[PDB]
């Protein structure tokens, strides 16, 4: 959409929380990205990513086939109290749940089946989605239709972790404080100069 981008402009999103918190160049690079979005009012513009995005509604359907859950789509949900912070789960499930879908490279999917666990960056993403929505768990789905039937679908439930959420909110608050100050600082300097 264009409303898709507009709702996300200048905000810390759940999909990037791992860049915020890691112990880093990725934190500073994301900070620079959000500074430029807020100042310029626009964001900067592969095969596997595109193929992935296009498969996600297949994955969504497969999950409902496998579970019988009522799934509603949702856009960006703002954090209830931290301004400039939001999350975009791939669905609201029932009254208290969520779904986050990955449709990655085949080997990444296989490694998820092997370990049974989502990458730590996706744990952060999903805890943040829970933070923003008030939900109690998120079913993490990995899906690859290239594989034999009994390997295409993987799902595991990640329960709300209030300790991790409090730590995320602390870090994201600190990061947003630095972001807003940097923008204020740059602006005051340019204004004085002019």
Give yes or no for a contact between 43 and 5, defined as CB atoms under 8 angstroms apart.
yes
Cβ atoms within 10 A of the Cβ of 186, count? 12
Query: Do the Cβ atoms of 109 and 59 come closer than 8 Å?
Result: no
Best CA proximity match to 141, nearest among 79, 78, 86, 97? 97
Q: Is 82 in the site for a copy of itself (CB under 8 A)?
A: no
Which member of 23, 25, 107, 116 binds a copy of itself (CB under 8 A)?
A: 107
Query: x-or-dash pattern for a copy of itself, window 167-186, by CB under 8 A?
Result: -------------------x
Kindly tell me the number of DSSP H helices and DSSP E strands found in the chain. Answer: 7, 8
165 binds a copy of itself (CB under 8 A): no
What is the spatial distance between Cα 30 and Cα 28, in angstroms, rounded to a whole number? Answer: 5
Residues 46 and 105 sit within 8 Å (Cβ to Cβ) = no
Window 83-102: contact mask with a copy of itself (x via CB under 8 A)? --------------------
**Residue 138 near Mg ion by CB under 5 A:** no
42 binds, among a copy of itself, Mg ion, none (CB under 5 to 8 A by kind): a copy of itself
* Min CB(15)–Mg ion separation in Å: 6
Question: Is 50 near a copy of itself (CB under 8 A)?
Answer: no
CA distance 192 to 194: 6
User: Residue 77 interacts with Mg ion (CB under 5 A)?
Assistant: no
Classify residue 113 as left (phi > 0), alpha (psi -120 to 50) or beta: alpha
- Does 101 help bind Mg ion (rule: CB under 5 A)? yes
Q: Output the smallest distance, CB 100 to Mg ion, in A.
A: 5
Instruction: Return the range that interacts with Mg ion (CB under 5 A); candidates 47-55, 99-107, 113-121, 147-155.
Output: 99-107
Residue 101 near which of a copy of itself, Mg ion, none (CB within 5-8 Å, type-dependent): Mg ion
Sheet holding 77-78, edge to edge: 12-13, 85-87, 77-78
Question: For residues 106 and 75, is the Cβ–Cβ distance under 8 A?
Answer: no
Interacting residues with a copy of itself (CB under 8 A): 32-33, 35-36, 39-40, 42, 44-45, 47, 105-107, 110, 113, 146-148, 150-151, 186-187, 190-191, 193-194
């Amino acid at each position: 959409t264009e409303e898709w981008f507009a709702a996300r402009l200048g905000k810390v999103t759940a999909s990037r929380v791992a860049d915020v918190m890691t112990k880093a160049a990725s934190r500073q690079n994301y900070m620079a990205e959000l500074i430029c979005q807020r100042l310029t009012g626009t964001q900067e513009i592969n095969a596997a990513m595109q193929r992935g995005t296009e498969l996600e509604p297949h994955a969504r359907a497969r999950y409902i086939i496998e579970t019988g859950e009522i799934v509603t789509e949702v856009g960006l949900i703002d954090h209830p109290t931290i301004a400039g912070f939001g999350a975009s789960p791939d669905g609201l499930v029932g009254d208290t749940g969520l779904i986050e879908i990955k449709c990655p490279n085949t080997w990444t999917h296989i490694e998820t089946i092997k370990t049974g666990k989502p990458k730590p960056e996706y744990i952060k993403q999903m805890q943040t989605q829970m933070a923003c929505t008030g939900r109690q768990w998120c079913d993490f789905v990995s899906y690859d239709d290239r594989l034999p039937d009994d390997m295409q679908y993987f799902c595991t439930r990640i329960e709300r972790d209030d300790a991790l959420i409090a730590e995320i909110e602390t870090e994201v608050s600190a990061f947003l404080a630095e972001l807003e100050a940097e923008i204020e600082y740059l602006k005051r300097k340019a204004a004085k100069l002019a």
